[PDB]
Design a protein around this nucleic acid. Structure first.
Ligand SMILES: Nc1ncnc2c1ncn2[C@H]1C[C@H](O)[C@@H](COP(=O)(O)OP(=O)(O)OP(=O)(O)O)O1
Ligand SMILES: [Ca+2]
Ligand SMILES: [Mg+2]
Length: 430
DNA sequence: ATTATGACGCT
DNA sequence: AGCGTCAT
């Protein structure tokens, strides 16, 4: 009853760029704008691998994880932009730099958590309290929410999508009770006003469009964001959760898309998030562990407490390359040449990071994969990172892995290496 | 031959 | 620490 917390204490948004690497390439090359197009890395094997797809191209069935040659079968006029190659490998610098553009604009409105290269969480609780006082109990006009969807509305007593959006928004606003400065629904609404402003700023200042979700926590904000992509934002209220979750496959919720989510489904014999409510907290803890059990018990009620971390910068800087199939590294000097290439890119990124961000990495992590294994990593080893020098780092990397070499001859490498990975970690201020 | 990343959990 | 899971 009155003591039952409802997880409505915060306003959290998740902002996710639409088709992000494609938009980065479309800004650069106007010929690609408003076209079926995709971003591809490498080319020789099956046309290259697609890693981003414009919404026009998605209409033909083109997806990421698809080979370009197969995508071209679905969409013959598909336009392609290639990821830059440097020192023999894909280089994602253009997209990392575009990410920084967006992250810095968002940071003007509130403290953000960088969740990926193209999305960030925002805790807007304080900002909402602020805007609420300047409003002075003045109603929120629909005009302040021109791209907002209210999930679950309209309901009850039509052809158009935009017409439906406004119908829902009007029902929402008509029911709002703006006299209450602590009404969670009002707080979410003001949150949505701020996110309209944030998203307008991003588009004005970068040319990039994005979607967003506004709710009371990170998981609901993330889920909300995807409900109306692209170029729209969605408010998921606490009240909307029972209907939303009643038909929501468990795998859709962030962290449940893998083995844990499959286990929830198998063990409990359920399909939808809402079905979790019928279990006690102790029951869920018994199957999934103390932390997961408590998390699930609250999450299926729309409640989650994970804070938006004040972290705008990545915690690690890494360089990785696969050597598939026949290209697997079978000689020592192959291994050393590629360790150097990776180390040279790593040094480049590390030196720029030190200048920009006043920090220095102190630990180097070296990872390889051997032909045979289908784990991502076969072996992970750390060593000290004392100097930003590629030759030193590549020599150090070689030292920590050289005994993985089974071949009695030391010119050769067996089994051949199908992956190298260098990662700089454990930053300190400098 | 679904690549190049990046965060967080377990023991 | 090294490994696994999940994610984009
Ligand atoms: N598995 C991956 N491998 C390599 N790059 C990826 C992968 N997934 C995503 N990316 C890159 C390319 C994406 O443009 C970018 C952001 O990913 P993501 O948000 O999932 O899709 P997207 O921004 O391209 O489309 P949208 O968000 O509109 O569905 O990160
Ligand atoms: Ca995105
Ligand atoms: Mg994303």
């Amino acid at each position: 009853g009155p003591h039952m917390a409802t997880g409505q204490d915060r306003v959290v948004a998740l902002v996710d760029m639409d088709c992000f690497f494609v938009q980065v390439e479309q800004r650069q090359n106007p010929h690609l704008r408003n076209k079926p197009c995709a971003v591809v890395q490498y080319k020789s094997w099956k046309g290259g691998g697609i890693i981003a797809v414009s919404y026009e191209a998605r209409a033909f069935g083109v997806t990421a994880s698809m080979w370009a040659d197969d995508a071209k079968k679905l969409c013959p006029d598909l336009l392609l932009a290639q990821v830059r190659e440097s020192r023999g490998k894909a280089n994602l610098t253009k997209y990392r730099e575009a990410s920084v553009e967006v992250m810095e604009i968002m940071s003007r409105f509130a403290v953000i958590e960088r969740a990926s290269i193209d999305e960030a969480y925002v805790d807007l609780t304080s900002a909402v309290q602020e805007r609420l006082q300047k409003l002075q109990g003045q109603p929120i006009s629909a005009d302040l929410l021109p791209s907002t969807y209210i999930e679950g509305l309209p309901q009850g007593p039509t052809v158009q999508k935009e017409g439906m959006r406004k119908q829902g928004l009007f029902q929402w606003l008509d029911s709002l009770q703006i006299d209450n400065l602590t009404s969670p629904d009002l707080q979410l609404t003001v949150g949505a006003v701020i996110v309209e402003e944030m998203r307008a700023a991003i588009e004005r200042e970068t040319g990039f469009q994005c979607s967003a979700g506004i709710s009371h926590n990170k998981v609901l904000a993330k889920l909300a964001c995807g409900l109306n992509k692209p170029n729209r934002q969605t408010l998921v209220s606490h009240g909307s959760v029972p209907q939303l979750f009643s038909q929501m496959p468990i795998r859709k919720i962030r962290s449940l898309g893998g083995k844990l989510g499959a286990s929830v489904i198998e063990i409990l014999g359920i399909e939808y998030m809402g079905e979790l409510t019928q279990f006690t907290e102790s029951q869920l803890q018994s199957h999934f562990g103390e932390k997961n059990g408590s998390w699930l018990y609250a999450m299926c009620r729309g409640i989650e407490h994970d804070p938006v971390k004040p972290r705008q910068l990545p915690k690690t800087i890494g360089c990785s390359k696969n050597f598939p199939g026949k290209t697997a590294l079978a000689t020592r000097e192959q291994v050393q040449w590629w360790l150097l290439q990776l180390a040279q890119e790593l040094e480049e990124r590390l030196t720029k990071d030190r200048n920009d961000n006043d920090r220095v990495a102190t630990q180097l992590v070296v990872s390889i994969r051997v032909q045979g294994d289908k784990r991502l990593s076969s072996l992970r080893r750390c060593c000290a990172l004392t100097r930003y020098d590629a030759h030193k780092m590549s020599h150090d990397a070689f030292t920590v892995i050289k005994n993985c070499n089974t071949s009695g001859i030391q010119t050769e490498w067996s089994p051949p290496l199908t992956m190298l990975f260098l990662c700089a970690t454990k930053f300190s201020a400098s």
